[PDB]
Amino acid sequence: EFDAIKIALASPDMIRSWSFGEVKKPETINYRTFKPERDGLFCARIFGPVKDYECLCGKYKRLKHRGVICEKCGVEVTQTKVRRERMGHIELASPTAHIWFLKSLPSRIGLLLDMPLRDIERVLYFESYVVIEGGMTNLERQQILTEEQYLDALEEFGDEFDAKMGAEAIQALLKSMDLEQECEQLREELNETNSETKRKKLTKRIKLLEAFVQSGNKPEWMILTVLPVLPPDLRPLVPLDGGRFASDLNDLYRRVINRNNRLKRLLDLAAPDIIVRNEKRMLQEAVDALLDNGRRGRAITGSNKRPLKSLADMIKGKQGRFRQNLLGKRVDYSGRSVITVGPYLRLHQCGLPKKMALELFKPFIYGKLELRGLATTIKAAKKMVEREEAVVWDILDEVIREHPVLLNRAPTLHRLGIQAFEPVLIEGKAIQLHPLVCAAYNADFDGDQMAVHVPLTLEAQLEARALMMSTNNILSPANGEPIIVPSQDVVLGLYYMTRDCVNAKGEGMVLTGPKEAERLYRSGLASLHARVKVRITEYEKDANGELVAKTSLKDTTVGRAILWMIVPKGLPYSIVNQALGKKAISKMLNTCYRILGLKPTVIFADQIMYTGFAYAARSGASVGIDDMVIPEKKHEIISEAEAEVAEIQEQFQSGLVTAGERYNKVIDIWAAANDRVSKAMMDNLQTETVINRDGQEEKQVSFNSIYMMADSGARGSAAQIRQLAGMRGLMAKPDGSIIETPITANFREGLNVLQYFISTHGARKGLADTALKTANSGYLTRRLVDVAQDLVVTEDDCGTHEGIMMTPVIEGGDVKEPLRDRVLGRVTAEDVLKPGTADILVPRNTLLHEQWCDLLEENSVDAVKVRSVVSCDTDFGVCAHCYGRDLARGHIINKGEAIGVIAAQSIGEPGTQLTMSSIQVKNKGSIKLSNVKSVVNSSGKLVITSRNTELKLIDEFGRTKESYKVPYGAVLAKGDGEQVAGGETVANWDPHTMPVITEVSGFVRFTDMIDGQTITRQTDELTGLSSLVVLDSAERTAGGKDLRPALKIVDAQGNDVLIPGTDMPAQYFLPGKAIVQLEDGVQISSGDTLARIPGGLPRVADLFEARRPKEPAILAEISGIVSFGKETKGKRRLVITPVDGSDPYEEMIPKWRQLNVFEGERVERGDVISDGPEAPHDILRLRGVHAVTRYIVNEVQDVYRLQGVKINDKHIEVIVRQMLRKATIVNAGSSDFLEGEQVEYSRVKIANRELEANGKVGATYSRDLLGITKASLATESFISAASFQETTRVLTEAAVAGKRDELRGLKENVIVGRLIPAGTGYAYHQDAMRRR
Amino acid sequence: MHARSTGSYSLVTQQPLGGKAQFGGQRFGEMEVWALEAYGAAYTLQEMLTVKSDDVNGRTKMYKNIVDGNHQMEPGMPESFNVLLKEIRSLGINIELED
DNA sequence: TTTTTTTTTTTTTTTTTTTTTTTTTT
DNA sequence: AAAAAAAAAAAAAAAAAAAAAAAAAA
Ligand SMILES: [Zn+2]
């Protein structure tokens, strides 16, 4: 309908434009009759008639006279709605100061005039003075005076000089100030002045002044001269049940009117200066309390001693209108009850108890009734329906013929927790709910009470049936897996289908088709499953969307062939020819959707449900005590473990071992025994079925119910069945330390008092942790949504060439996430270059869906440059191509559809599910190295002279299937560009001790080694060959402190050896506390040692907050040769000298850290200095946007994968992009924004973009990595901030800025109550945007 | 079991009451608001929080549509926006709509 | 003479500020 | 060697999770 709301400062002309009268008298109501008073708080002509089209005099009650005013009472005959709307005003003889700017803190006025707040406060309340146009006097223009020095000024300068007091003086000051000169002088001071406090206050002053210049407001408007007054209806006078009239705003306005009238009367009578001073002070205080009571000192009171309510109160606090009525409300036409299944229903449809239908649709039934004319009047229709007469049910069916409704759950974590369905009228008193969707609702049938809502407008029906419909909601938003996977029971039946018994009825014949297979099964002539060749037909779509029907014999189980019918035509048979695990069936649905679209998937899933339930009933799948088996070896294994622990305890008693070591070995052997028991029982379970084959004997997979359950993946896991049959492992204590004695017994047998007691400790710890985790996950999810409420898709394509690089992930072991998953559904930024080089494998800006991804996979594409949202160049939004596929839908994301909310919600949903040496290369491939700087040691092996080195095993194809981080000086049996057999130990090293391996070879002279002052001669008591020991700084004398321990290699001639690539000698300095092994007169080989140098959900939350770690891993700010600086000035100083750049940057370090780099090393920026936790912000400002984003996504993905839940990275991409929206300027350039000024990225981006579009230059900036909560605070949407914990500062800033608040943003549209500019409304809004 | 179609409004605000002892209605939470926002469904959220929890023309005309058999809404604008706007106007604040 | 006002019969967290210490230049 | 600016670390102040009778003023 309209566009961005505009805020600004009120003006007296604006005020009188809005107002339509003055309340010159303080009366409210006659209180003898019920008529009002003329020009009172309730007035007729000023506001309007109390009643509908009735003059107060009563001259014109007729609609014909609408609009024309009477003359007896001068009342415009009109609806009383005008009274709700018409403002008013009060003329103020003296200017009144606006309290909001007086105590905004930072007070706008105090710092606009550049004046302290105490002084201006004293001046306002009429106990001081202020110089106005001081000119050629002994008095500064800004100076304040008091009574005695006011008299002094009168004496010396009773002439032209003028000094005033109070709000009138402040108004004169505000009129007598200049804007452009202030900007000029302040800019000059900022350019020249170099005091940081001065710089800060000046940038604040200049930003405010230049904004106000940008604003059309005038400073005197900050001073009130005419006071607007509320319409009477919004300040109602409610008569209680008796002769009494209880709103305090009426009292405040009455007091203000009385004070103003008395001030006018005194001025007419010309009361002395002190009396008018006091009256003005009282009027100012009255206006202040009216606006803000309690903002000033001790507030006025209401009833007895309790404070009354002011306008700020009306707007602030929980009772404030934003927090009062824009929040979780209650809803009519809503219901709730506990839920049941009714499996015979369909996922496109839901149950609903008949009574709920009766009460919910009363107006609908009334409309259909009066349409049929069964009872014309509404009251009779109400009587008919409450009587529950016969015909009403026909009407109910008619209205329910097509009228979907919303079903909801209380803990609405992810968006499927609300969902649209078609009701069917069901008897009873509980809601039948479709089975599979419950898993999406994660709502067990423990007694969960779900609620129900009903859309009203046909557009809402369209939205529900088109958007919130189960048919339209089959895949998760977090990722593409079908959320409709069957959960626990029907999966058992299907597993029972596709499993073979070697010999039974119906084993060893042939069938022409599945139909006779079902016929024979139902006959009981054949078993449910047996290997049998049967002819089946498939219908393949390899052609250009054309069916090809082929047929052939296939060996299969009877149940499997019976299942084949339910498959749609498109799919093949190999997919069903397996055991059909939960993952297997999940990918079955995945294939069905990916090949045959949606409706065939829906029908297929429905029939899967029905048939699997039916045949699970046929199964008689049971469970019994005998069905669990305890291997006899459990007794023997436990006996062996008891003997071993007794032996180790005796060994400890013998003193060979310690208590700690004793306990460690004991728990190790207990765990090993438990593993043996687990293997024994699993073998006993899986293949227990040993039977004749129709011959002698055969062993097959077991048909015990428990193994069918576990292997089917219906419920549980290996650990739980391990608990059921065997020992339930080792329990920890409340302190968390694992207990020495495991749970020797198992559940099937009895558990002693103690084992149950400890298990209860553990379980209760888990329960309390679950409760705490629930609360914390809820709070964190709240944070994630509120930070990301704004972001929305607004453009298709940013036309950007720039994107992220995506590769598989290897932590130092197996690849944990492949390239196919990370890249799917995403539009490539750069084309794919296969290693058939000079091959554009795919276009440059195309979406990558499953067929393309598989093409890439078989093409062995390892690293792909893909578009990302962070790289999006969308002004005030995001480009669709930057975002790629909209998961939960097939097509690319559509225009307008917002994604921040769904991203936050998806990432937050599993917050409940979260938790609160040497290397043996396995694969065979050639050796590649990264960050490579190595040398052949004396022994001939390859050692690495680069800390950040990493080894890749280039596979036979060419891709890096294995990657491992190589520490320093590692032992390599091979080298780069060579071949290593699979399973050959090349990666090995000594993790302890930091080596002093030498780059070059030559005599090792004592260059700068002072004995007895710098180093000490410590003798070894084992062999005899001692070693010089370098002390630390503090232990030695200060004289030896500066004397460095240096090891300079020299050739046979004694001259320095020039290291290749440079001329500096091979000096190898040492740190403190270093044992210098070698001595003078010894030549060394290359790579030879010289001396012996001695998480859960909160983690994710901190990563969002990006909190600095306890000991950050310091990185190199700037590239260049490193060097040491001043020593022990609290911290040691390092300086990097770029070879050509500027050196003087120095960095302090607490030298107690185990440093990494040597003194004479030349490095690139963003290079680790101290090792440990890594901050994000350093990565941003040194590596860049891509590095920090990649780290964050990798870590969070690792966490969620560790917990077993998968989430698409794009959600983290968008939350990170929002997290970094702000930035700090580096230079103003041609732009007017100040140097250190902090500004939102998009603003300066568009600004310098347009500036460079002209001949002018842009500006330099630096993106800032702001914490999520801080970013939420720092948002241009002040309406959001107004509803965010405060109104005073927010509205002061908005008014002084006069910001035209974009409808962009999400909560704000809800807060004002207008439509979302995200979904349909977006499109609608565009029409409005097209209209304007 | 409990539901409601058209009962009494709360004294402090024109919103449905809650609970069973008093004939209230189900409570729509803010996470449910976020989920609605998650779906593209726009009119649903607006009417649910506006006419199913205010506008005199909106609810009256909805009654007329439903009794007439029409299923359609004039969204208009819910007067609470006007309450806030004129409250701000009473303050020395020039806040206004735009084209 | 009547009505309104004044007086007598809770703890935790965060942020803002101020003081002291440390670094730098004269 | 000494003065002054800047840093940061501690402290505390602010925010958020009742009726009856007498005196004074109109
Ligand atoms: Zn009249």
Ligand SMILES: [Zn+2]
């Ligand atoms: Zn873009």
